[PDB]
Amino acid sequence: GAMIHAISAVNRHLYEDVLEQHFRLRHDIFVEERHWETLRRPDGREVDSYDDEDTVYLLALEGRRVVGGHRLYPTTKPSMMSEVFPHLAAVRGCPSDPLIWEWSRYFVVRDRRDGALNLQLMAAVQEFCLDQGIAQVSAIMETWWLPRFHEAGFVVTPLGLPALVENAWTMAATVDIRRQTLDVLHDRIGMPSIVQQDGPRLDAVARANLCG
Ligand SMILES: Nc1ncnc2c1ncn2[C@@H]1O[C@H](CSCC[C@H](N)C(=O)O)[C@@H](O)[C@H]1O
Numbered sequence: 001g002a003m004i005h006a007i008s009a010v011n012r013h014l015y016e017d018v019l020e021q022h023f024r025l026r027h028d029i030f031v032e033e034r035h036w037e038t039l040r041r042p043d044g045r046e047v048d049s050y051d052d053e054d055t056v057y058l059l060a061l062e063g064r065r066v067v068g069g070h071r072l073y074p075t076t077k078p079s080m081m082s083e084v085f086p087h088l089a090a091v092r093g094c095p096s097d098p099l100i101w102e103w104s105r106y107f108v109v110r111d112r113r114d115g116a117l118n119l120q121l122m123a124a125v126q127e128f129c130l131d132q133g134i135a136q137v138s139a140i141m142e143t144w145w146l147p148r149f150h151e152a153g154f155v156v157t158p159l160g161l162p163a164l165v166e167n168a169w170t171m172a173a174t175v176d177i178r179r180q181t182l183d184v185l186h187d188r189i190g191m192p193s194i195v196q197q198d199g200p201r202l203d204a205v206a207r208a209n210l211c212g
Pocket of ligand 1: 036037038039048049050080084103104105106139140141142165166170
């Protein structure tokens with residue numbers, strides 16, 4: 001039934017309504033609920049420096065209603081890790097590679113929490129990246145994500161020492177994209193595919209190569 005839609009520069013003309021809706025939900029969730037005050041904006045849209053022409057959005061849609069999602073950004077451009085949190089990756093270094101994309105802004109609307117959507121969103125990042133030939137995703141995440149990643153079978157590689165970020169323990173890591181990880185998740189969600197790709201085909205790795 002309901003799917004996760006891959007939205008990028010090549011097909012966003014089919015999703016302008018949905019994209020604006022997701023920016024407002026991000027404000028509701030990350031600003032009003034999670035109190036990430038540095039992200040508050042007077043337009044009520046949660047938009048940062050990594051929302052541009054090269055961003056890819058993976059949004060869970062029920063009809064045209066956004067119920068969850070996350071985003072991917074090429075590490076060949078200045079990234080949140082390289083610009084905002086490079087000290088979190090001081091041991092191994094910040095990623096910079098067309099085959100590594102930065103993963104952020106994971107959310108589920110209140111109406112869909114503690115249900116089937118969460119594991120579908122985990123499957124979605126693996127499915128999209130495997131299809132595109134992306135090898136790893138990078139993340140700056142709160143340490144409570146570690147057991148969640150492990151529960152979903154995600155292979156995680158820490159890049160530096162955990163540190164407090166605005167009162168919350170946070171760490172930089174890569175996640176390995178794995179066919180085997182995805183296969184298990186497909187079985188668990190009971191669907192052979194969770195990512196829908198409408199409109200023109202996106203060549204993500206090619207685009208990321210152009211960026212650097
Ligand atoms: N573009 C940005 N610039 C500066 N800080 C940001 C940011 N995006 C998120 N943050 C901060 O990072 C912390 C959350 S943890 C890091 C980012 C988070 N995993 C995400 O998905 O976005 C919060 O304190 C938040 O205010």
